[PDB]
Each structure stands twice: as C-alpha cells, then as structure tokens.
C-alpha cells in the first residue's frame with residue numbers, strides 16, 4: 001500500500017503554465033479561461049485494487065476509477081473522450097491519455113506535504129500543486 005501516500009482530500013494552491021498546456025491539448029478560449037480559474041478539490045481513495053480520483057470544482061466535476069495497468073475510458077474536464085492507462089513507476093502515478101491520434105501524460109507525485117501534478121503535451125509542461133484540504 002505505497003499508494004497510501006496519495007489518499008486523502010487535496011485542494012489546488014498553485015498552477016504554472018497551465019494555459020499553455022491546455023492550448024497544446026486543444027482546449028478552446030472560453031474553456032481555458034473558466035477552467036483556469038478553478039481551484040478544484042481532489043479526493044483520492046483506494047479500495048482493494050481500485051483507485052478512485054475525484055475532482056470537484058466550480059467548473060466541472062470529474063471522476064475516474066481504475067486498476068493500475070488496465071486501460072479505461074475517461075471523460076476529461078474539457079470533454080475529451082480518451083483512453084487512459086495509469087501505472088505506478090517508482091512511486092509516481094503515470095497517467096497516459098490517448099485520443100484522436102494524440103497523447104498527453106499526467107504525473108502525480110508526493111513531495112513534502114504536497115501533491116504535485118505535472119501535465120505534459122509535446123514540449124509543454126505545467127505544474128499544479130495541491131495541499132491537504
């Protein structure tokens with residue numbers, strides 16, 4: 001139960017370069033503005049082999065439940081319909097999303113008391129930092 005360190009309730013405190021990430025992904029103007037304002041709460045839980053990541057915000061709510069290494073269907077906050085696979089590599093959750101011939105990778109890691117979310121599309125990276133709620 002190493003995934004233990006992720007479990008909890010988390011609140012966004014900072015975001016860097018996320019507009020550029022969203023642009024690279026294909027998000028349109030109005031969604032970038034509204035999504036970029038949001039300060040979501042993320043709730044991570046584990047029950048047996050199933051991990052659940054729920055995000056609640058003023059903009060959209062999202063929820064994914066998955067088993068590591070097992071592809072699943074996901075609806076993203078920006079309404080992409082993707083095929084997702086999440087693995088644990090050296091204590092980092094690595095989440096690859098595939099859609100329309102494109103790919104993006106989201107890494108989630110624990111650093112000090114924070115949960116750091118790094119979103120990468122092509123050469124663009126963004127960092128989102130969460131603290132315990």
Ligand SMILES: O=C(O)[C@H]1C[C@@H]1c1cc2ccccc2n1Cc1cccc(Cl)c1
Pocket residue numbers: 022025027035036038040055056057059060061062076077078106117119128
């Ligand atoms: O967990 C994170 O920090 C980022 C992985 C999540 C992510 C990807 C993505 C792509 C496009 C637009 C927004 C997007 N959001 C953030 C986000 C913003 C507003 C409300 C909600 Cl529920 C989620």
